[PDB]
Enzyme design. Structure first.
Site, PDB file in Angstrom:
ATOM      1  N   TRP B  60      17.486  26.692   4.154  1.00 25.91           N
ATOM      2  CA  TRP B  60      16.697  25.795   4.984  1.00 25.91           C
ATOM      3  C   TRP B  60      16.830  26.158   6.458  1.00 25.91           C
ATOM      4  O   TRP B  60      17.745  26.887   6.844  1.00 25.91           O
ATOM      5  CB  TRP B  60      17.087  24.321   4.756  1.00 25.91           C
ATOM      6  CG  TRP B  60      18.555  23.984   4.843  1.00 25.91           C
ATOM      7  CD1 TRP B  60      19.601  24.842   5.034  1.00 25.91           C
ATOM      8  CD2 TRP B  60      19.124  22.671   4.747  1.00 25.91           C
ATOM      9  NE1 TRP B  60      20.788  24.139   5.064  1.00 25.91           N
ATOM     10  CE2 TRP B  60      20.519  22.804   4.895  1.00 25.91           C
ATOM     11  CE3 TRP B  60      18.583  21.389   4.559  1.00 25.91           C
ATOM     12  CZ2 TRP B  60      21.385  21.707   4.844  1.00 25.91           C
ATOM     13  CZ3 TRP B  60      19.446  20.300   4.509  1.00 25.91           C
ATOM     14  CH2 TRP B  60      20.829  20.469   4.651  1.00 25.91           C
ATOM     15  N   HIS B  68       1.661  19.525  20.155  1.00 23.11           N
ATOM     16  CA  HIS B  68       0.338  20.178  20.222  1.00 23.11           C
ATOM     17  C   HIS B  68       0.408  21.691  19.941  1.00 23.11           C
ATOM     18  O   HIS B  68      -0.380  22.491  20.451  1.00 23.11           O
ATOM     19  CB  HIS B  68      -0.322  19.847  21.582  1.00 23.11           C
ATOM     20  CG  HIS B  68      -0.526  18.381  21.767  1.00 23.11           C
ATOM     21  ND1 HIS B  68      -1.738  17.758  21.555  1.00 23.11           N
ATOM     22  CD2 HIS B  68       0.361  17.387  22.041  1.00 23.11           C
ATOM     23  CE1 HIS B  68      -1.604  16.458  21.741  1.00 23.11           C
ATOM     24  NE2 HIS B  68      -0.333  16.207  22.022  1.00 23.11           N
ATOM     25  N   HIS B  72      -3.249  21.218  14.816  1.00 25.69           N
ATOM     26  CA  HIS B  72      -2.657  19.938  15.136  1.00 25.69           C
ATOM     27  C   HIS B  72      -3.685  18.873  15.485  1.00 25.69           C
ATOM     28  O   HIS B  72      -4.875  19.146  15.720  1.00 25.69           O
ATOM     29  CB  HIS B  72      -1.632  20.083  16.277  1.00 25.69           C
ATOM     30  CG  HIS B  72      -2.229  20.300  17.636  1.00 25.69           C
ATOM     31  ND1 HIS B  72      -2.571  21.546  18.120  1.00 25.69           N
ATOM     32  CD2 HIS B  72      -2.521  19.419  18.629  1.00 25.69           C
ATOM     33  CE1 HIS B  72      -3.044  21.425  19.353  1.00 25.69           C
ATOM     34  NE2 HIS B  72      -3.020  20.146  19.681  1.00 25.69           N
ATOM     35  N   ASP B  74      -4.598  15.360  17.716  1.00 21.66           N
ATOM     36  CA  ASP B  74      -4.384  14.682  19.007  1.00 21.66           C
ATOM     37  C   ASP B  74      -4.678  13.195  18.885  1.00 21.66           C
ATOM     38  O   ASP B  74      -5.746  12.788  18.432  1.00 21.66           O
ATOM     39  CB  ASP B  74      -5.246  15.324  20.118  1.00 21.66           C
ATOM     40  CG  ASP B  74      -4.710  16.678  20.542  1.00 21.66           C
ATOM     41  OD1 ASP B  74      -3.979  17.286  19.755  1.00 21.66           O
ATOM     42  OD2 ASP B  74      -4.980  17.135  21.656  1.00 21.66           O
ATOM     43  N   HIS B  78      -2.414  10.782  24.015  1.00 19.08           N
ATOM     44  CA  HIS B  78      -2.287  12.086  24.632  1.00 19.08           C
ATOM     45  C   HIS B  78      -2.929  12.127  26.030  1.00 19.08           C
ATOM     46  O   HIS B  78      -2.495  12.874  26.883  1.00 19.08           O
ATOM     47  CB  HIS B  78      -2.923  13.148  23.739  1.00 19.08           C
ATOM     48  CG  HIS B  78      -2.862  14.531  24.292  1.00 19.08           C
ATOM     49  ND1 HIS B  78      -1.797  14.998  25.036  1.00 19.08           N
ATOM     50  CD2 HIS B  78      -3.737  15.567  24.199  1.00 19.08           C
ATOM     51  CE1 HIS B  78      -2.012  16.255  25.373  1.00 19.08           C
ATOM     52  NE2 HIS B  78      -3.183  16.623  24.873  1.00 19.08           N
ATOM     53  N   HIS B 206     -11.103  15.338  25.658  1.00 18.45           N
ATOM     54  CA  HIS B 206      -9.888  14.529  25.714  1.00 18.45           C
ATOM     55  C   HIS B 206     -10.122  13.205  26.431  1.00 18.45           C
ATOM     56  O   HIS B 206      -9.825  12.134  25.907  1.00 18.45           O
ATOM     57  CB  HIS B 206      -8.765  15.293  26.408  1.00 18.45           C
ATOM     58  CG  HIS B 206      -8.247  16.448  25.620  1.00 18.45           C
ATOM     59  ND1 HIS B 206      -8.740  17.728  25.767  1.00 18.45           N
ATOM     60  CD2 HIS B 206      -7.305  16.518  24.649  1.00 18.45           C
ATOM     61  CE1 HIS B 206      -8.102  18.538  24.945  1.00 18.45           C
ATOM     62  NE2 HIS B 206      -7.235  17.826  24.245  1.00 18.45           N
TER      63      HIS B 206
HETATM   64  N1  LIG Z   1      19.861  20.737   1.425  1.00 17.75           N
HETATM   65  C1  LIG Z   1      20.747  20.272   0.418  1.00 17.75           C
HETATM   66  C2  LIG Z   1      21.928  20.974   0.244  1.00 17.75           C
HETATM   67  C3  LIG Z   1      22.847  20.570  -0.713  1.00 17.75           C
HETATM   68  C4  LIG Z   1      22.579  19.463  -1.501  1.00 17.75           C
HETATM   69  C5  LIG Z   1      21.400  18.761  -1.332  1.00 17.75           C
HETATM   70  C6  LIG Z   1      20.469  19.147  -0.373  1.00 17.75           C
HETATM   71  C7  LIG Z   1      19.204  18.286  -0.277  1.00 17.75           C
HETATM   72  O1  LIG Z   1      19.207  17.227  -0.876  1.00 17.75           O
HETATM   73  C8  LIG Z   1      17.929  18.663   0.469  1.00 17.75           C
HETATM   74  O2  LIG Z   1      17.176  19.523  -0.046  1.00 17.75           O
HETATM   75  O3  LIG Z   1      17.570  18.130   1.568  1.00 17.75           O
HETATM   76  N1  LIG Z   2      -2.326  19.066  26.600  1.00 18.58           N
HETATM   77  C1  LIG Z   2      -3.414  19.452  27.416  1.00 18.58           C
HETATM   78  C2  LIG Z   2      -3.262  19.328  28.786  1.00 18.58           C
HETATM   79  C3  LIG Z   2      -4.291  19.687  29.637  1.00 18.58           C
HETATM   80  C4  LIG Z   2      -5.474  20.178  29.111  1.00 18.58           C
HETATM   81  C5  LIG Z   2      -5.625  20.301  27.742  1.00 18.58           C
HETATM   82  C6  LIG Z   2      -4.604  19.945  26.873  1.00 18.58           C
HETATM   83  C7  LIG Z   2      -4.883  20.125  25.382  1.00 18.58           C
HETATM   84  O1  LIG Z   2      -5.871  20.759  25.084  1.00 18.58           O
HETATM   85  C8  LIG Z   2      -4.093  19.567  24.213  1.00 18.58           C
HETATM   86  O2  LIG Z   2      -4.100  18.325  24.036  1.00 18.58           O
HETATM   87  O3  LIG Z   2      -3.490  20.314  23.370  1.00 18.58           O
HETATM   88 MN   LIG Z   3      -3.573  18.775  21.142  1.00 18.96          MN
END
Ligand SMILES: Nc1ccccc1C(=O)C(=O)O
Ligand SMILES: Nc1ccccc1C(=O)C(=O)O
Ligand SMILES: [Mn+2]
Ligand SMILES: [Mn+2]
Lengths: 255, 255
Positions: B60, B68, B72, B74, B78, B206
């Site tokens: 993991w 963003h 994604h 919005d 935002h 936006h």
């Molecule tokens: N990441 C693990 C490691 C050991 C035992 C259990 C887990 C989980 O339950 C899990 O997948 O979040």
């Molecule tokens: N976070 C911003 C700030 C200024 C202009 C545009 C944006 C985005 O396009 C956005 O929401 O990902």
């Molecule tokens: Mn965005």
């Protein structure tokens, strides 16, 4: 078509959507492992700007977490047994797996009486005699109302480890081999019981589900709002490159 | 009823699921702002364990990104204009907003001829003469096939800023006031044109959408696999506490 009628149902309220997701925030517990192992991180977020000199007309955050934080999805590559299964990471799982039928087995009375309450083959057979055979490729959710426990009660760590409900190896093997379920979901922090390390095999939900290329859901909320049968689960994980899982917004559509 | 038919369709393949999501990875471009401002972060991930001494039977990662980053969603909060609308953060948006009808307006021929191609009311009117009136509370997607562009071509940054297709203020205003859409989506990095800072109001998608409590989707993929009408969009963002948006797995169900 079925899609036009779903649209009409959602519009009129004949079909309702239930949110099965806990809010992501720094205080929500994550699974705790023995200290010698690497640990799952909690959710964190920080402002980039909030309508200020850093960004006058907008607000947004940076976020950090682990793949297995909060309400989340486990892909087969999460476990050693799923190391060589096809499409084992969240970015490779076929999309049709993300929407499908779900059944809910109510084990809430059992969990209220026993922290280590076990989902067994017998319970499944009893459930099927009442609600019909589990359809192939279905999501199976173990309802426990564990999502109502807050504080230290949620992980429920004692000196000999966490104590929280879960499936026996026999229950999981039955669901996989005899019913070909798509995946298994819980309201607890793990898909295995708190004491699940001590089953044979250790962590049988993880070992058997992921070894079979099946999926897990954990930290689900509001299962008490779902019918035993007839609901449709939406569980689409983030498309993380080689990801072993991810937080996600889990929803259920219900009539 | 309608859900039973959806399940049947999904199982048989009469209903298909199209993945509209780009892979989350460090290399996928994010929006770039003038350097005096805080910037959107790229996706990052690190191993906690990989079936080794750090975690013998499991694998993991820890992950970090912005709200963003990548494909994604919005939320109204935002933008400064949507700071105070009810249900303005991603954790407050009603779950029924996450599944609904979607229409796709094909602007790919135009985008291929003009980096700064503009979706206008007139173009929308042309679309409607062919495909019927945009239904109320629908998602509107501006298809440009911009997602086919790789490398620096995707942001398309020049000396005077990014150049990429987008809606005019009049187009957005028309969709909101005259059609009452649920939200607006694109295959580019923003819901606004690359040169959208120079519209009035600045970044009108936006400002106007989020001011009306409407939603945005960005960096969508595979829009060329969708019908103009008839599909259902699934766009459920992470339940981030006070979140302004989140990466998500966007899907479309198609007949
Ligand atoms: N990441 C693990 C490691 C050991 C035992 C259990 C887990 C989980 O339950 C899990 O997948 O979040
Ligand atoms: N976070 C911003 C700030 C200024 C202009 C545009 C944006 C985005 O396009 C956005 O929401 O990902
Ligand atoms: Mn965005
Ligand atoms: Mn997990």
């Amino acid at each position: 078509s079925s899609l036009n009628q779903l649209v009409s149902g959602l519009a009129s309220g004949a079909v309702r959507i239930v949110d099965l997701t806990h809010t992501l925030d720094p205080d929500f517990p994550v699974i705790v492992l023995p200290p010698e192992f690497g640990q799952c991180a909690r959710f964190r977020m920080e402002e980039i700007s909030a309508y200020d000199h850093r960004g006058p007309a907008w607000k947004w955050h940076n976020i950090s977490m682990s793949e297995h934080t909060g309400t989340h999805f486990d892909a087969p590559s999460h476990w050693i047994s799923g190391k060589d299964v096809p499409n084992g990471s969240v970015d490779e799982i076929p999309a049709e797996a993300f929407v499908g039928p779900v059944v809910v087995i109510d084990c809430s009375k059992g969990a209220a009486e026993n922290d280590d309450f076990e989902l067994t083959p017998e319970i499944i057979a009893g459930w099927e005699s009442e609600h019909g055979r589990i359809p192939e490729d279905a999501w199976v959710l173990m309802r426990t109302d564990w999502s109502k426990r807050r504080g230290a009660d949620y992980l429920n760590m004692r000196a000999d480890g966490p104590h929280s409900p879960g499936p026996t190896p026999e229950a999981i093997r039955f669901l996989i081999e005899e019913r070909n379920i798509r995946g298994f979901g819980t309201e607890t922090v793990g898909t295995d019981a708190g004491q699940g390390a001590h089953y044979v095999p250790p962590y049988p939900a993880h070992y058997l589900l992921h070894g079979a290329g099946k999926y897990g859901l954990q930290c689900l909320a509001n299962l008490d709002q779902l019918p035993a049968t007839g609901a449709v689960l939406i569980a689409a994980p983030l498309k993380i490159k080689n990801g072993t899982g991810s937080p996600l917004r889990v929803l259920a559509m219900v009539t």
